[PDB]
Structures are given as C-alpha cells and as structure tokens.
C-alpha cells in the first residue's frame, strides 16, 4: 500500500509549475501573438486551451494520483493491452535528455561569460568577427550578437554538417556536467529534496521576470513594442495556420505525454483535489508566457527606437532570441553586466525545474517496475546521467547545434502526438470515461461535468489528429540555415520517432499472443483493469 508522498502541497505544485515552464514560454509564445495578429491570437489560444489543451493536462494528472504509480504501471494497471504506452512515453523522456539539457549549459556558459565591465558580444572588431558583421540585426548582414553565439560560443562555422561534429568543446563540457551535478543532487534523494528545490527554480524566474519587466517598460520605445505584441488583427481568426500554431502551442506547452504529470501526481495523496490543481497550474503557465511576452517586446521596441533596427529582424522565436537578440539590446543599456547575470540565471532556472520532471518520470516510472533499482536510486541515476553526459558530449561538439536541432525536430515531435492519442482513447474508450469519472469522484468527491469527458472522448482526438494533419501538409526536410540535412539523418530521426511509438503495437501484439485462451477471451483479459 504505502508510497512516499510530497513534503507539502506546495512542493507538488511548484514542481509541476516549474516542469511546465521553460523557454517555450518565452521564445514561442511571444512570437506567436506577434505574427498571428496580437491579442486576437489569444482568442484561438484561449479556445484551444479550453477545449483541447487543459482536458489532457487534467487527464494525465488525475491518473497520476489515482493509479498511484509510474507511467508504465499506470498504463499497466489500466489497460494492459496498451501497457506499451507507458514504455513509449518513458523512453521519449529518456531521449530528450540527450539534447534538451544542453540549453542550460549554454545559459551557464553565457552566465560565466557575463562577468565583466565590458560585454564581449557588442563588438564587431573581435577575432571571431567577419566583414559580414553589423552591430545589430540587419537584413543581409550578421549581428555581432549572432556572430558571438556562432563563431565563438558554438564554433558552428567549423562544422560542415552533421557528418562532421568536429572537436568536443570542453568549456561546454564542464558546463553540461555542472548541469548534471545539479540535476543529480536535485533528484539525488527522493522527492524530499526535489520537491523543496523547485522553490528556487520555479520561483527565481518570476523574480527576474519582474525586474526585467520594469526595466523593459522604462526604456524609450517600450510603449511601442507592446503594440507590436498585442495589436489586434482579426483576419487571422479565419486563418487555418493560426489555429494550428495556437493549438500546437496550447498542446505542446502544457506537457502531457512524457509521463511526468502522471509521475508527479502519483506522490499526491489519494484525496488531494487535483481538479483545482489542474486549473491553477495551467493558468500560471499561460500567464507566465503572456507576461514574458510583455518582457520581450518592451526590450524589442527599445531596439527599434533607440537602436534603430527593423522589427522583422529582431522578432524571433527559438534560442536565437534569448541568446542573440535579447542580449544585444541589454549590452546597450546601463548596468549592463547586472541584467545579463539575472537573465542567464533565469534561463538556467527555467530549464532545470523542467528537466527534473523528465528524469523523474523516468526514475519513478522504473522504480514501480524493477524493485532493486528502487532500493538504490542512488547510483541508478549516476549511471543514467553519466550515460547522458557521455552521449551529451556529442552536442558538446562543434557541430552540436546540428545535432541538437536534429533531436529537437524529430525525437519528441510526432512521437509525443500519437503517444498521447492512445492515452486518450485507452482512457476515454478502452477504460471508459464512466469508470474514469467514478474514480475521480472517489478521489475529489465530485465527478467531472458533461463538458470534460466531451473533450477527452471526442474533442481531444479530433484536436490531436487536426495537429498532425496540418503537421504533414506543412512538412519539409530537416534544414537549418542554408544547410539541408542528409536524408539518412532524416531517416535516422524517424527511428527515434518510431522507437517510441513502436512500443505500443509491440506490447499489444506480444501480450495478446502471450496470453492463453480463445483469441476473443484473451483480449478481455487485456481490457480488464488491474483493480478488477
């Protein structure tokens, strides 16, 4: 019976809030409102969140504290035909760790590089600069903030493609190791530590968000940039590709499918109200994005006012924004060295809290399967991380971004989409909503309204399928800048996409064949829930 529980009600929330918050909130949320026509975008973002996004976020968290164990066992004890879903989900989380954790290493490298009176990346006259360089972002030229990030930090110019990684960059190496020594000692013992640690990582950004929020709005052109961000154009309401971006954001940002919320929620008490917790966690997430949206463009306007740069050049998503565009602006304003250290510190604490949930959903998932690795987490992770670290030297290499971008566009991209789809179907159909509700009434004391399951049973699959339909339509081969990825890399990427999903039909096939009796009555064995 007995399973370990959170230190406190807060330690749970903070973990989930921390986990669910990352640079996707910063660098894709602001850019969407901009290109999708401002606050108007918040309509489709709102609807997609309401019907599509949250119901899933709610479902993964409910199962978590109800079935009381890790992703595998949770899908084991629910619909054992589909127990493969548990497997798929976890190795996805396993995969991501080969790349995602690399970001915090860049942040700390910048952070470590931020100690000085005069910032390095403001200048076009340095050794790593080329005649193509300009002091700020310009059409047809390379910003000195970009040329710093590439020719010096990454050394990505020395890579001819993915085939050539080049030398391992060791300044990055010990930076990545520092991240794992942190992620280690955070997860090092139980949720007794990690639950407490998130109080920093899930909070500190909200602090730095503030003093950057004011510092950004005090600048000369800030009143302008906010107009760019929120200035409404309602023609987009009729644009298909707007609901795609919004629906994708709504879905990808909340984070179901990595088996984490399932994992975290497991340490919850059985009767803890997780409906309230689902709604509150969601809100903070979307809010935290909408806020940073204000934080970015106030700094963006200032560059378009004082620094005199075209908007279309500095309005950007992805790592280029936070590692190039933003720091470009900061170096200009007073107290430069201060703003840097808190920004990079914020980026770091933005990654850490998130990564924990992934590593945790892996460990917690296994601890409820293989007992003697529960006896020692304790050097289980030590292998895992050092395994991460050793492979993590691939991304620590000059062609690292090419590697990084590859796992990004492939690993969790279509893998997580189908993985969830079965979670919905298995729960809403195989397991049934009637018994899923009846579970939650025993938990929180009241069953979900006719609204929620309508999202689980119908809306969600129509919603997910809608994303992959327009996901394929807009498909192109993997490319970064002028570099087009070799089709073997593309194929190799689908393996990492397929190795996740392939678990589902694998375990489905295996078990029903590995079950005795009539083929019709060996299925009912796999339809019948563990509790029954």
């Amino acid at each position, epitope marked *: 019976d007995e399973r370990e529980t959170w230190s406190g009600k807060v330690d749970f929330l903070l973990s989930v809030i921390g986990f669910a918050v990352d640079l996707a909130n910063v660098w894709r949320f602001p850019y969407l409102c901009y290109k999708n026509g401002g606050g108007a975008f918040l309509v489709p973002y709102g609807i997609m969140l309401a019907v599509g996004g949250i119901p899933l976020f709610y479902m993964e968290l409910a199962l978590g504290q109800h079935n009381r164990k890790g992703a595998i066992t949770c899908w084991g004890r629910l619909v054992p035909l589909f127990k493969g879903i548990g497997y798929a989900v976890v190795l996805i989380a396993f995969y991501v760790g080969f790349y995602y954790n690399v970001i915090i290493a860049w942040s700390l490298r910048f952070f470590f590089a931020s100690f000085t009176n005069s910032l390095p990346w403001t200048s076009c006259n340095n050794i790593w600069n080329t005649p193509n360089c300009r002091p700020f972002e310009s059409q047809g030229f390379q910003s000195a903030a970009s040329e710093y990030f590439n020719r010096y930090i990454l050394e990505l110019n020395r890579s001819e493609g993915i085939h050539d990684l080049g030398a391992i960059k060791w300044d990055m190496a010990l930076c990545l190791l520092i991240v794992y020594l942190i992620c280690y000692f955070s997860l090092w013992k139980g949720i007794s530590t990690s639950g407490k640690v998130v109080w920093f990582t899930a909070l500190f950004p909200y602090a730095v968000l503030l003093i950057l929020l004011i510092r950004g709005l005090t600048l000369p052109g800030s009143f302008l940039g906010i107009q760019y961000y929120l200035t409404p154009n309602f023609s987009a309401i009729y644009k298909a590709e707007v609901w795609v971006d919004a629906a994708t954001q709504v879905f990808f940002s909340l984070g179901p499918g990595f088996g984490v919320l399932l994992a975290y929620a497991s340490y919850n008490k059985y009767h803890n109200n997780v409906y309230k917790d689902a709604l509150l966690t969601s809100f903070i997430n979307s809010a935290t994005s909408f806020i940073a949206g204000f934080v970015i463009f106030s700094v963006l306007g200032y560059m378009a006012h004082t620094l005199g740069v075209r908007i279309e050049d500095v309005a950007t998503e992805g790592p280029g924004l936070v590692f190039v565009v933003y720091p470009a602006a900061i170096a200009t304003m007073p107290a430069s060295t201060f703003w840097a250290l808190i920004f990079f510190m914020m980026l770091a604490t933005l990654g850490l809290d998130s990564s924990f949930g992934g590593m945790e959903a892996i460990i917690t998932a296994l601890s409820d399967e293989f007992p003697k690795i529960k006896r020692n987490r304790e050097l289980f992770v030590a292998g895992l991380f050092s395994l991460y670290f050793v492979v993590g030297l691939a991304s620590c290499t000059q062609g690292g971004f090419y590697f990084f971008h590859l796992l990004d566009r492939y690993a969790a991209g279509y893998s997580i989409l189908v993985a969830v789809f079965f979670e919905a179907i298995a729960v809403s159909w195989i397991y049934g909503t*009637n*018994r899923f*509700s*009846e579970d939650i*009434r*025993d938990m929180i*004391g*009241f*069953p979900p309204g006719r609204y929620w399951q309508v999202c689980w049973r119908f809306v969600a699959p129509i919603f997910l399928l809608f994303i992959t339909v327009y996901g394929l339509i807009g498909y192109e081969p993997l490319t970064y800048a002028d570099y087009v990825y070799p089709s073997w890399a593309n194929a190799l990427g689908w393996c990492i996409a397929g190795s996740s999903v392939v678990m589902i039909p694998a375990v489905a096939i295996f078990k029903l064949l590995s079950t005795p009796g009539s083929l019709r009555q060996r299925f009912t064995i796999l339809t019948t829930p563990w*509790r029954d």
Partner: antibody, heavy 119, light 109 residues
C-alpha cells in the same frame, strides 16, 4: 419526478438474514452513487453504506461491516444491500438515499422501509 | 468516527421569532462538506442546506447557515409554523459518514 422506493423488510428473528431493495426512477442511475442510511425509533439517523456508480468503490460502517453487503443493479435500476447475522440493535427504518457529490450531500430520499428484529 | 453533537435537542418557539441551532463536531471539518437536513414528523428527510451557506431548492430564503471548523449553525431568521420539524447536520469530510443528534423545533403556544 424522481422517486425511490424501498421494498421488503418486516419482522425477523435475531440472527436471521434479509435484505431490501430501492427502486430508482426518473434519473440516470448508472451515474449516481447511492447510499443506505437508517434511522432508529430513537429518531437518530445513522449511515450504513455507500456504493459508487459503477460500484467499484464501496464504503461500510463499522457497526455493520461484515454483517452487511451492498449491491447494485444498474441494468434494472435497482439498489439493494445484503444483511446477515442481524441484531436487535439493527432495528430501524432503512432509507434509500442518493448523492454523487459529497460536497452537495444527499439530494433525494426514499419513502423508507421498516425493519423489526425481534425474538 | 467524527461525532456531531447538536444543541439544543428540543426547542420551543413562537412564530416570527428568530431561532438558531448549533452543530458541533469532534474533529475539524471541510467547510463545504457539512450539510443540513429537515425532517417533518412521519415523513422522510429533506436536504435543506448543502455546502455550508447554500440552500436547496424550495427552501425559503429565511433559512441561513454559517460557521466552520468544529462550529456550525443553522439560523431560521423568522419562523412560520410550517417550519416545525427536526433538523440534522452531516459531514462528508470522511468515512464513516455521520449525522448529528438532531434539533427538534416545536411551536410555542
């Protein structure tokens, strides 16, 4: 509109066994957890047992448990318990009462059915 | 078990007068989980007040309720004779579920 009707019950010799049944009508029965609540001649309401909608979750009183078993037929819309090893302290009027939502209490109550346990 | 004691047990009241009844519990109770039932003589109980404040349907608004923790009260602001009955409170905070001792209203004459 909504009616619940307990049937059965009557005189029973101590140690005897019996149970009654609530006939639910007017609402979708599968979606509401039911509960049995009894009231003695001292006119004091005591809880007996609750059963979930699909009936996978069942809660009993400790003055009862092991002598009482609660059952659910959703197909026919029927709720009945099962009583065995009765006592004279088990004498009361037994109420069929429903609520799904704990936060909302018991929405609708049966007309009651009497039970007298006597030598 | 969480035992709910209700006071006072019998209550004589002249019409229009204000009456209040108290319900006190052995253990702290979730504010929303408490409830109040009205039982007229020779008929099954009725749900009167659910949550703590919230009245049921057909329940005149002259009824109100308040309190938290181990302290709760049902208040009939003004009284008609139609209000003579026995009132019970209940907690869903946990199993086994529990009813108070009951408060019997009887009109003063």
């Amino acid at each position: 509109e909504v009616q619940l009707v307990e049937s059965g019950g009557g005189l029973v010799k101590p140690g005897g066994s019996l149970k009654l049944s609530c006939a639910a009508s007017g609402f979708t029965f599968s979606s509401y957890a039911m509960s049995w609540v009894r009231q003695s001649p001292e006119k004091r309401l005591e809880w007996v047992a609750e059963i979930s909608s699909g009936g996978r979750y069942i809660y009993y009183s400790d003055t009862v448990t092991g002598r009482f078993t609660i059952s659910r037929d959703n197909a026919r819309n029927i709720l009945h318990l099962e009583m065995s090893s009765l006592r004279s302290e088990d004498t009361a009027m037994y109420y069929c009462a429903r609520g799904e939502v704990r936060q909302r209490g018991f929405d609708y109550w049966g007309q009651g059915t009497t039970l007298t346990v006597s030598s | 078990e969480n035992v709910l004691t209700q006071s006072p047990a019998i209550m004589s009241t002249s019409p229009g007068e204000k009456v209040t009844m108290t319900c006190r519990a052995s253990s702290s109770v979730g504010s929303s989980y408490l409830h109040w039932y009205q039982q007229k003589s020779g008929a099954s109980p009725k749900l009167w007040i659910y949550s703590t404040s919230n009245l049921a349907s057909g329940v005149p608004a002259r009824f109100s309720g308040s309190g938290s923790g181990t302290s709760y009260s049902l208040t009939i602001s003004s009284v008609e004779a139609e209000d003579a009955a026995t009132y019970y409170c209940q907690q869903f905070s946990g199993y086994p579920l529990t009813f108070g001792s009951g408060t019997k209203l009887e009109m003063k004459r």
